């Protein structure tokens, strides 16, 4: 499953038409885009690989 | 001269109310609805408000129709169910509104608050063409919102005076305490006038109705001279006077010899009207004569370009 | 390291609460001033 | 039509006619066969595409002739100071520019 | 093709085009009938013998029916009025149109 | 003068239904459905709900019927099968409503709910040309909604003034209070006179029906001028006084000894219209010349473009 | 005046009815099916009823009928074998509907329900040309289902005044009272009578047949002016008083010195007609002299733009 | 306009014709009298801004009127009159208590000897 | 009728130039300048869109 949440504070008066705003336009702009099962499990680093990342010397 | 005629409350006041709107009829003439994008997109909510959605993409060329502002006037102490009058003009390109009728417009204040609703008819003037993209609604607007007032509050009412002037005032004052008991009135500037009445609604609202309908004299207020300008018009006061002086201007030069007439001095608004008669001119050259004679001095009053 | 603490240059809250405003004087004007600076 | 007797009907009625108006002039869009000019400042397309460029007062045309240019300022140019949208700009120090069938 | 009136012309002419909407107009914006809209991303258009029309999409390999342009048979064509812009219209001496599918 | 002629109730009250709606018949003339799109799309809405489903692709090039928005007055006190009078005006760019017909349209509210149904024969009138875009159907709406109401609750009601004047609210109080018993009215305001009556509906219909037809008189309400300016109309009040001044327009002079005529003072209308029309000019000259003398005082009176 | 003739009975009320039909005949002059899609799709249905079914793909090009819809009245305890008449109107783009008959065409209410069956012929007037595409048909709908109704139960019954007035609702109590038993009626509003009468649908037919035909005096209603601006047309009830004012419009003077006519003050209809005419305008100028006089004051009624 | 139109309620697309010509971008002028009181009422002159031709019977739409320190102190909406060879000027016209003072003027008045 | 600007991509409409029809073409007087006006004989110009 894939999970798309948006949150912020908008204007009343840049809604233009058919109650439509641009993304841009909104303040406290918070944006979510994440997945879950084993596609979402593929693109983690591994707890190895992420303990090298943050540790290992160059 | 009445107190109501040259003085004004202080709680009783006027407000101003705008509003769009959309007038249907018209019998064509209304606007282009390719040059007046709004008129296509208000008349598109109001279709889906009631419930039709016209799809986004379309031709809709109507010309029946006129995108138009309502102006109205919310009066003092407006009630709830009271209605009011609209003056609704063409917003677009209409050609006329000449049968045209206003569908529910809301009329807001300077708050954005909606203060009434004006639908109805409207009516136009049917070589001086009468104006036939601006037409007026008697009655049109139903009132829905009331202003709090603190009137009935209180044991002081100020009285203002239009065109303040401290005479104004101190004959304001020396009548309201003649008609009234000793102190009822006292003036504060040249244009206020605090006066003590007792304290609730009904017993306020009759001692202004007493004062209101006072028989107040006026004095002399001042010497001016209004010139237009715009309208060709040229205005004195009663206590105009003219000094003794001599002008010359173009083309115009003594009956009988010649140029350099003389003004004799007046006192009063006749000899004045005389004397300037007789220095011959239309109103357009009397104007800059005017002009001249003040800046030279010979005129015992202020001139006012309106 | 990443993990090490550290202070964003935008400090301080990065929002605002609207003022509701002041209440109207009942004067019989719609119009109302906003405490001019 | 405009029937003669009323039981005639005249079919073919008169009419004469005047003038051959070129409605339009239109302007086939097909795929221009490309041709080997061995130099670099030179770009072609393959299909549908044009490139678009800022002209002088802002307002952005297109035109499908790559026969870019590099201008003092390190701007891309297009015969004429057409300065292509969006804006990039070469830098002197790189030796050689390629520019891949992706577009980057 | 359906004139700007509402009235129906008939013209015997393909030089057609896609307006900014994708309809199928004939030199001079006049839309033919029945509607036939191109999709934005279509990249070819055929037009089969018997009357079909299918465009190629984008990705897709398949030339999706997209419409079907019938042709109009009047028992007398000479009858018809001219009208100029390469059109004519019904008059009562051509007799009523019999639309059809091409070939039928 | 009336206490009905000059008050309205607190409780009566009118409201604004507004509805869209289609116009049958109409020998042609009717809307252009290549331009108005919403006609045709209402006119398959209708007969898809009749049981007639149209192809989503076909022509629909009709000319006999016109969309149209129908405007309603919401009486105070309507109930359920009253009947009342709409106003249907042209939406699209229908050419006339000659002899048409609008179809059950529904008048809703401002709230959105159906508040009529309107049904019924368009009536229109058959170089001063009639509006052929805009008809009356006299009892073609029928009430389907009741507007819940407090009349008949509590022991007060509250008179509401046109124009409202404290001396008017005054004198209505002492009318009041002198037909009914002491103590039976109390000006609140300017513009709302409080009357007690007793509790129930009967009691109260009885009470206004006693209080409506009083006669009390109308006291002079103020020196007010209204100038059109889009219509060529000057209006003035009975009030109006003149002061003495000197005006001077263009085009205009003494009949006789030229520009500058003298314009005595006048205390009354008679002797005010007297002397403005000594002064020879024009409507829209003497709209000017009073705007001027306005500015410049000698008019006591207020002037308000309309 | 008579009861009936201005008010209403609670459960007495009509309804609307719409349908969709055909017309056959008309000499040619009917719909052009290839610009009226639903005109053929309509006959084919039809014919497919009567056991015709007609190839889909077809010319159809058919000129002798005409889409129409048609309008009843469904009256107040309609019965299933009576009649009603029927008024149709042209749909699509037919030229006229001189002869036609109209087949079989079902008349539903508002929830969608057959409530008639409408069949018969056309009748259709025979420069002011008459409507060719309305007709109306006499007896021309059979009724098919009756409304359910709570006449004759309960004890009360409410009579609905049309342009409800307090006087004119204490008025009618009143003469109820008087002409039946004490108590018999009660005013609830300005616009209903609760009236007790026993129960019984006998015993309430008899009461409500003797009220209807009482006679009631009518009181002065209100000092109203109607002014059309579509049709050129100004109305002035009996009530209406003119105040004193001086009004200039363009193009009028006096006969004879000048513009600016006096208006003297009338207190019946007959003065101020004979006033309004010797300020000697058209009605086009009336309205518009009326509309400032009224925004001016001077004017004791109330005036409406319809 | 648009930014009215906005403010009213209706949001215009930024990318439209827009061709109007029933409406004239005007300059209002006023003079604060002395002693001004917040209900009482100024007229107000109205000066073409922009290339209208003529505003014979135009309706000024609640304008606020600001002294120098960019205060508002009025509100001017009304009814234009103007003058119906010495033509008159077309492009300017006056309203009679046009404008609705807004604001106070603090004074010394009464104050000192 | 309609025109385009320098850079806008869409032609801003500017004007209606309507047609007016007589019941009698032949009734109208000339004054020259290639004008006529309207007569007692050619009634009252009756003001169109062209092509309705």
């Not at chain 2, 379309?58 to 010309?63: F, G, I």
Request: proline share 5%.
């Amino acid at each position: 499953t894939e999970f798309i949440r948006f949150s912020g504070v908008v204007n009343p008066r840049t809604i233009s038409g058919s109650n439509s705003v641009p993304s841009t336009q909104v303040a406290d702009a918070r944006i979510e885009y994440v997945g879950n099962g084993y596609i979402n499990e593929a693109q983690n680093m591994g707890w190895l690989q992420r303990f090298f990342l943050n540790l290992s010397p160059m | 001269e009445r107190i109501r005629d040259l003085t004004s409350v202080q709680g009783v006041r006027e407000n101003s109310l705008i509003g769009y709107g959309l007038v249907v009829g018209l019998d064509g003439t209304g606007d282009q609805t390719t040059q007046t994008p709004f008129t296509t997109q208000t008349l598109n909510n109001m279709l889906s408000q009631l419930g039709i959605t016209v799809p986004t993409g379309t031709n809709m060329q109507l010309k029946n129709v006129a995108a138009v502002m309502v102006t109205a006037s919310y009066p003092p102490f407006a009630r709830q169910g009271q209605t009011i009058d609209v003056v609704v003009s063409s917003m677009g390109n209409a050609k006329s509104l000449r049968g045209g009728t206003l569908l529910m417009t809301p009329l807001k204040g300077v708050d954005s608050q909606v203060y009434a609703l004006a639908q109805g008819n409207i009516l136009v003037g049917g070589v001086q063409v009468n104006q036939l993209n601006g037409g007026r609604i008697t009655n049109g607007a139903i009132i829905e919102r009331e202003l709090p007032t603190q009137f009935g509050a209180g044991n002081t009412i100020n009285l203002q005076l239009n065109d303040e002037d401290f005479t104004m005032a101190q004959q304001i004052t020396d009548a309201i305490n003649r008609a009234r008991g000793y102190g009822s009135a006292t003036a504060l500037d040249a244009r206020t006038v605090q006066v003590r009445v007792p304290s609730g609604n009904s017993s306020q609202v009759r001692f202004l109705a007493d004062i209101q309908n006072m028989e107040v004299n006026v004095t002399p207020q001042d010497a001016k001279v209004v010139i237009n300008s715009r309208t060709g018009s040229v205005v004195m006061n009663r206590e105009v006077t003219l000094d003794s002086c001599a002008v010359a201007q173009g083309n115009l030069s003594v009956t009988v010899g010649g140029s350099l007439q003389s003004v004799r001095s007046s006192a009063n608004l006749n000899s004045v009207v005389r004397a300037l008669n007789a220095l011959g001119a239309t109103p357009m050259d009397l104007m800059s004569i005017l002009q001249s004679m003040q800046s030279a001095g010979c005129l015992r009053a202020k001139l006012e370009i309106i | 390291c990443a993990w090490i603490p550290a202070k964003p240059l935008v400090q301080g809250a990065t929002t605002a609460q609207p003022i509701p405003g002041p209440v109207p004087v009942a004067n019989g004007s719609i119009f109302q001033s906003a405490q001019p600076i | 039509g405009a029937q003669s007797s009323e039981q005639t009907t005249l079919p073919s009625g008169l009419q004469i006619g005047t003038g051959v108006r070129p409605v339009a002039t239109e302007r086939l869009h097909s795929q221009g066969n490309l041709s080997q000019t061995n130099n670099s400042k030179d770009v072609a397309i393959k299909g549908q595409g044009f490139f678009q460029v800022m002209l002088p007062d802002g307002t952005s045309a297109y035109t499908r002739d790559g026969s870019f240019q590099v201008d003092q300022n390190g701007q891309l140019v297009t015969a004429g100071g057409f300065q292509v949208q969006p804006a990039i700009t070469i830098p002197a120090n790189a030796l050689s520019i390629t520019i891949g069938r992706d577009g980057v | 093709v359906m004139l700007p009136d509402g009235t129906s012309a008939y013209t015997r002419d393909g030089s057609f085009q896609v307006d900014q909407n994708g309809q199928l107009v004939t030199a001079g914006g006049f839309q033919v009938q029945p509607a036939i809209t191109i999709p934005a991303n279509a990249l070819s258009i055929t037009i089969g013998r018997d009357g079909v029309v299918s465009v190629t999409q984008q990705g897709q390999a398949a030339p999706v029916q997209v419409g079907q342009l019938n042709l109009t048979t009047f028992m007398n064509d000479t009858g018809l009025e001219s009208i100029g812009e390469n059109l004519y219209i019904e008059t009562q001496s051509s007799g009523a149109p019999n639309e059809s599918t091409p070939g039928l």
